[PDB]
Design a protein around this ligand. Structure first.
Ligand SMILES: CC(C)(C)c1snc([O-])c1C[C@H]([NH3+])C(=O)O
Ligand SMILES: CC(C)(C)c1snc([O-])c1C[C@H]([NH3+])C(=O)O
Lengths: 258, 258
């Protein structure tokens, strides 16, 4: 009866509080999605337990074993009742799980270290001196892998063949790579995360150019779950009340460092 | 030609240095195994690259897919040339990878919060008020799962059926659980790690009683790797020179906090 929430450690959506070893249950975490989960639970009238996804993945269907991993897999195989995280709504996932209307809009974007002579995806695709990649798993990588758009196909061809690998395991690694590469590495990630990092010291990164696409994050539930309807209505209510905007401002700008 | 070393983040064997985002390659890590790897490389005359195992696992053969995971899998499938970590030498693993003679001896042991009325495995097995478990994966769990020793069989029966789960994902979680349980949780882990934690503030934990078994950690290489022989001779030389003891004292006691 206690709703099991699967989420993922991804600043500023879900983070461990300072000296968390001394805290219990949900009180161990904080962030945009922690606040969102509380608001949704409050609106839908249920108790919940926040759990961090085991493999630390968002969700992808293995070609080899066909087994969904990450938060999507947790829902598909009945391990969790709802996923509250920066989980991108995609066609492939929509076929196996349900998504509420978007609680946040974003698009793939380019992160560069300030000073890098790049302002668009076309620019990256037309040169080789500045390397570029994405999270080694996730919707961003999948977008490039499945895209037939000329520029993105060219970018994907390069990325999947680049050696050393241009892919990273976490956002933190992607950021560190941009920073330590002296402008020789550009990172492709979702816009709202790009905007978040822009506000983190040493304030040496920036989002450049427009977004490569447009999509959103949604609250996910198992396909056909009765919880889906109510959660979707809560997201809409929260959006209309301005709560969603308040949360972004709180975690992105109020706590900004630049 | 550069030896790929697979290891795992497990204090004090391998740890991220303070403000590591600003460091490159092997310089990002420190610890007992980082030092050991350097000594072995120096003795065998090769260059190497330290890499953290992807799934953060030691190594187990999935029953379902039969696919080895963790550092053992990295060696089995040819992703790494050598594993330098607190990898326990077991019969099952010895059948698929090679191990040098032990570079460290240890045994499964009991970790309790000071004050807990427990001094042995028999004591734990004869009561229910104090819960107890192990790493959710690894040689310790496997020992209990495969054991036919009366006391350990009884302990395993309890552990695999206990609800909530008595298993943890990491040593850190096992320790935090012992500490936050007010003596209501005992943790089963290898002795040298138990001894390490004993030296960490708040100095509220302790190893109690004798060990449940006797074994060791070995440097692992792919089955039949030419690198195995030389690495084994290096471990023996390093042991005879007192280097192995120096490293333990350095990371356990010299840096002790109790
Ligand atoms: C970690 C973060 C959410 C910022 C990013 S950046 N590029 C991605 O593919 C992702 C993961 C994606 N949203 C997903 O749900 O798979
Ligand atoms: C993490 C640490 C090495 C202390 C422990 S404690 N109990 C275990 O099973 C392990 C893992 C084990 N050595 C292995 O190689 O699987």
């Amino acid at each position: 009866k206690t709703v099991v929430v699967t989420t993922i450690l991804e600043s500023p959506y879900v983070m461990m509080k300072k000296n968390h070893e001394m805290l219990e249950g949900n009180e161990r975490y904080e962030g945009y999605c922690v606040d969102l989960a509380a608001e949704i639970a409050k609106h839908c009238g249920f108790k919940y337990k926040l759990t961090i996804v085991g493999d630390g993945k968002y969700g992808a269907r293995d070609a080899d074993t066909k087994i969904w991993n990450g938060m999507v897999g947790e829902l598909v195989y009945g391990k969790a009742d709802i996923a509250i995280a920066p989980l991108t709504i995609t066609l492939v996932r929509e076929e196996v799980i349900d998504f509420s209307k978007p609680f946040m809009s974003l698009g793939i974007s380019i992160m560069i270290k300030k000073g890098t002579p790049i302002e668009s995806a076309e620019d990256l695709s037309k040169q080789t001196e500045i390397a570029y990649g994405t999270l080694d798993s996730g919707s961003t990588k999948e977008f490039f892998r499945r895209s037939k758009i000329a520029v993105f196909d060219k970018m994907w061809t390069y990325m999947r063949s680049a050696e050393p690998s241009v892919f990273v395991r976490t956002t933190a690694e992607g950021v560190a790579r941009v920073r330590k590469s002296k402008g020789k590495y550009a990172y492709l990630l979702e816009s709202t995360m790009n905007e978040y990092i822009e506000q983190r010291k040493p304030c040496d990164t920036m989002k450049v150019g427009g977004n490569l696409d447009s999509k959103g994050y949604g609250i996910a539930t198992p396909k056909g779950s009765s919880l889906g309807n109510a959660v979707n209505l809560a997201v809409l209510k929260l959006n209309e009340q301005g709560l969603l905007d308040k949360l972004k401002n709180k975690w992105w700008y109020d706590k900004g460092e630049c």
